[PDB]
Tab-separated table of C-alpha atoms and ligand atoms in Angstrom:
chain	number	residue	atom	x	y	z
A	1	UNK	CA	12.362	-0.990	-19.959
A	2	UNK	CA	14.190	2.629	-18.968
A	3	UNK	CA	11.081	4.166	-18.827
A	4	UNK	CA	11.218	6.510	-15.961
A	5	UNK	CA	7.669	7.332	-15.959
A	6	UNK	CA	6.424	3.467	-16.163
A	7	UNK	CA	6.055	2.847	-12.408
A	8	UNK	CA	2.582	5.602	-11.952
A	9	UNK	CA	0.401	3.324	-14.155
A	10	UNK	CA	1.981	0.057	-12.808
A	11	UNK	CA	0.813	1.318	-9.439
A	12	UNK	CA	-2.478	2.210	-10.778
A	13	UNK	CA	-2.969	-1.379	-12.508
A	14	UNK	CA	-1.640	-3.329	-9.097
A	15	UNK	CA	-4.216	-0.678	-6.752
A	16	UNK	CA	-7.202	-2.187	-9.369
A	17	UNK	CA	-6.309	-5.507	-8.441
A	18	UNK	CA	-6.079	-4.956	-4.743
A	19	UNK	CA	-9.385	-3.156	-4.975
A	20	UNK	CA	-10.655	-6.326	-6.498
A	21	UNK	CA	-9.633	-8.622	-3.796
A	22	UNK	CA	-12.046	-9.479	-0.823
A	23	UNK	CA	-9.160	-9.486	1.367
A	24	UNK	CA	-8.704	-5.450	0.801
A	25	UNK	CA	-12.178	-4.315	2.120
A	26	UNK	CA	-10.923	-3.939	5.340
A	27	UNK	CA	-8.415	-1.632	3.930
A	28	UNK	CA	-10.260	0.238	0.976
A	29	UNK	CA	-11.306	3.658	3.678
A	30	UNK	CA	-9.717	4.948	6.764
A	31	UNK	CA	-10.001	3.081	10.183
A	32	UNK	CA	-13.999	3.592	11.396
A	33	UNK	CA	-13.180	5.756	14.795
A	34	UNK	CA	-17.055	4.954	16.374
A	35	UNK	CA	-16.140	1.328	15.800
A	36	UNK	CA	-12.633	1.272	17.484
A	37	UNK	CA	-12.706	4.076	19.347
A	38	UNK	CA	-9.095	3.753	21.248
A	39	UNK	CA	-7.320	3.794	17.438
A	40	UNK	CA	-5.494	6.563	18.223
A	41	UNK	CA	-4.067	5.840	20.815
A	42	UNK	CA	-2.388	3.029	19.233
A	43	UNK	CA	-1.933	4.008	15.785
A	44	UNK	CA	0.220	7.353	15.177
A	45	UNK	CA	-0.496	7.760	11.621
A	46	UNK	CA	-3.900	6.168	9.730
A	47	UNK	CA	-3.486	5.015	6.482
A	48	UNK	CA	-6.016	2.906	3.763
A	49	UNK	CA	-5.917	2.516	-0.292
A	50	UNK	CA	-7.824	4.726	-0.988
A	51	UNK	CA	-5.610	7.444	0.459
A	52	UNK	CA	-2.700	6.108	-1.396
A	53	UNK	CA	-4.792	6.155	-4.998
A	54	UNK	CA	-5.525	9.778	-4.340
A	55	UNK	CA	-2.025	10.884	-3.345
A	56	UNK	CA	-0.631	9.126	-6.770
A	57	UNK	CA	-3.908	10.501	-8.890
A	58	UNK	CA	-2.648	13.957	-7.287
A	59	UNK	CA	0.545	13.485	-8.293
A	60	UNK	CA	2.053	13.929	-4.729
A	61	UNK	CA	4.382	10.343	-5.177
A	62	UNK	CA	8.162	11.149	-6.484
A	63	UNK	CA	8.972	7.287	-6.632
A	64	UNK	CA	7.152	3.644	-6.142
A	65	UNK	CA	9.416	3.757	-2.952
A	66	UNK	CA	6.857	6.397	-2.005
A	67	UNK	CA	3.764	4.134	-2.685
A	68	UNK	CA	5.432	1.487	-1.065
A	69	UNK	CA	5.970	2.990	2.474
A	70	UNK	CA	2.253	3.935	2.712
A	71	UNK	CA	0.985	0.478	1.531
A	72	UNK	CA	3.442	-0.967	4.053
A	73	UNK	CA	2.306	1.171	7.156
A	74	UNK	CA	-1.555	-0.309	6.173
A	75	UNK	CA	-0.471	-3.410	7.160
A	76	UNK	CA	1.997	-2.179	10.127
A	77	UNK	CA	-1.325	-0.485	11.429
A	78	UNK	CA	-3.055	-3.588	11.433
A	79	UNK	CA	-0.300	-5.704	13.128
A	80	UNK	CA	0.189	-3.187	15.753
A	81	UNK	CA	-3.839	-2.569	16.229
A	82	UNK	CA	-4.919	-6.406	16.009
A	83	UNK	CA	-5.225	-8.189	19.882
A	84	UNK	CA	-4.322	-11.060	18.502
A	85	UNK	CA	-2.399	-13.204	15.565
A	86	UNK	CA	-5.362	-15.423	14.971
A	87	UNK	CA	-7.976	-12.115	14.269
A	88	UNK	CA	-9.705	-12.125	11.151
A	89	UNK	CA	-8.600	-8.379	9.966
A	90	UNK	CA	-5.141	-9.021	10.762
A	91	UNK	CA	-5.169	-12.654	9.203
A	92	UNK	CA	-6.388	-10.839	5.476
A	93	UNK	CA	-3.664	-8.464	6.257
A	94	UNK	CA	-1.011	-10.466	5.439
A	95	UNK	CA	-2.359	-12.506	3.004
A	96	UNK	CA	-2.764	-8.791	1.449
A	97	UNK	CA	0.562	-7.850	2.195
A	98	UNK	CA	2.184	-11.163	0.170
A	99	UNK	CA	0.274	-10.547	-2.922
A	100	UNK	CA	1.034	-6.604	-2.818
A	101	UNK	CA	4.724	-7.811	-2.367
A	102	UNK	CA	4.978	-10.401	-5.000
A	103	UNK	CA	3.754	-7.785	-7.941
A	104	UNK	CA	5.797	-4.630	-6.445
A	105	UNK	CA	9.051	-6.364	-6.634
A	106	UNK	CA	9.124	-5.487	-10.230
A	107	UNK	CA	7.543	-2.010	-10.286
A	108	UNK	CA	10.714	-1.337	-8.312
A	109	UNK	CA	13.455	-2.880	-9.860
A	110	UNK	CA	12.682	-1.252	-13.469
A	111	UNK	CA	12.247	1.946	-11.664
A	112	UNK	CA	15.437	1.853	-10.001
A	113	UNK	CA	17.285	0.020	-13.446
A	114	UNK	CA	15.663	2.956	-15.385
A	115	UNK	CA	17.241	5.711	-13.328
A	116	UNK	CA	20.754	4.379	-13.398
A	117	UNK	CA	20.640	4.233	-17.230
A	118	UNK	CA	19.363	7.908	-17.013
A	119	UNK	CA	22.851	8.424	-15.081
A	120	UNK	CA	24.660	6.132	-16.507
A	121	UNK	CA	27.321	8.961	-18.725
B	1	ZNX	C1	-16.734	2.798	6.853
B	1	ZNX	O1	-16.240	1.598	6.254
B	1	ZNX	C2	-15.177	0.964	6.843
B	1	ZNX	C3	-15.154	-0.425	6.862
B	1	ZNX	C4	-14.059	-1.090	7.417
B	1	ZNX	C5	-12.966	-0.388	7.916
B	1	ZNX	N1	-11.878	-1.018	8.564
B	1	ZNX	C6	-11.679	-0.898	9.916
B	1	ZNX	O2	-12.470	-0.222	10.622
B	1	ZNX	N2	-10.562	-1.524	10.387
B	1	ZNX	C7	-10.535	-2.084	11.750
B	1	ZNX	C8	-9.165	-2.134	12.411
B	1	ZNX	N3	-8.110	-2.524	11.470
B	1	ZNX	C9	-7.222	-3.484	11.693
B	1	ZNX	O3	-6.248	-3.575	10.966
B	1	ZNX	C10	-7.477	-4.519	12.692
B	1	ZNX	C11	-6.588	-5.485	13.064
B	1	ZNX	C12	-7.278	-6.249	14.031
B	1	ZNX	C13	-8.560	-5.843	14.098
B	1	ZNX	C14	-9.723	-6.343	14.861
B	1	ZNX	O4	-8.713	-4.729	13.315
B	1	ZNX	C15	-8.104	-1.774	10.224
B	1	ZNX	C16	-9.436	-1.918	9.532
B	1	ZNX	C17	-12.993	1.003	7.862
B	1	ZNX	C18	-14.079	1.675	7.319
């Protein structure tokens, strides 16, 4: 497809299906502060899923490369946060991070495909 446009509701299908996996509840809301309360001094910039629906609902994402750096840093954040390999949160994280991988490869190759036929004269 050269469908320029076709990556927003991609993104939006692939966020339902994260949202439907156990493994993202961890993930769905920003980092509980009260519960972990030296966060901040380990993690520079916060990020969750639902943050990333809203910015693409807004319209605030140019490109699925976009998307993709945000849904990365959730799982950067938890590697850097977790005290150990063998934690629970941190163990979800990257079975998370595989699926979200596996199904994005896609989203960006027909984006990127779809704007070099847009330049291709
Ligand atoms: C209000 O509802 C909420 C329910 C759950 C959450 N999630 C958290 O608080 N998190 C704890 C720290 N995180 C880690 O990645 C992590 C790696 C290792 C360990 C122990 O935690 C991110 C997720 C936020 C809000």
């Amino acid at each position: 497809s050269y469908d320029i446009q076709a990556w927003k509701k991609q993104c939006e299908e692939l966020l339902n299906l994260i949202f439907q996996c156990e493994d993202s509840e961890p993930f769905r809301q920003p980092v509980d502060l009260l519960e972990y309360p030296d966060y901040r001094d380990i993690i520079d910039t916060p990020m969750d899923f639902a943050t990333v629906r809203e910015t693409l609902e807004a319209g605030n994402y140019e490109s699925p490369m976009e998307l993709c750096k945000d849904v990365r840093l959730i799982f950067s954040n938890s590697k850097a946060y977790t005290p150990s390999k063998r934690s629970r949160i941190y163990s979800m994280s990257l079975r998370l991070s595989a699926f979200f991988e596996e199904h994005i490869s896609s989203v960006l190759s027909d984006y990127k495909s779809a704007l070099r036929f847009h330049k291709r004269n």
